RNA sequence: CAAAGUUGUGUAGUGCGAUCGGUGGAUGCCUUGGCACCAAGAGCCGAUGAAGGACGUUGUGACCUGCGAUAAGCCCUGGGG
């Protein structure tokens with residue numbers, strides 16, 4: 001899974017929790033990469049892409065491009 | 070055999086020719102680059118912060134191109150497969 005437009009079915013607070021969880025996962029991945037672990041390197045970019053998606057949804061809600069749930 | 074006389078000279082090197090190579094990158098044939106134009110556009114950008122940059126950004130060392138900590142990319146829409 002890589003997240004998609006179903007993030008628009010979530011609420012603001014749980015989307016922000018999603019942001020925090022994604023940031024923590026990226027932190028762990030970066031530490032693994034530094035320490036020599038993390039064979040799965042593509043996730044290291046996909047997590048940042050997911051953060052971008054969640055910020056996209058939040059900003060469209062904030063700017064009223066899409067009606068806020 | 071002696072006497073008198075004649076002629077000859079490449080083991081150092083060199084010249085010329087032929088031949089076989091080396092160096093060199095001319096020539097010929099090209100080209101992801103230029104040059105001069107034609108036709109149609111567009112003729113402004115900027116405090117909603119420009120022109121141009123610095124630094125950063127990739128699974129990984131650099132540089133170029135793109136991008137800006139949402140960082141060779143995020144979303145919507147249409148096309149295409």
Ligand SMILES: [Mg+2]
Pocket residue numbers: none
């Ligand atoms: Mg003209």
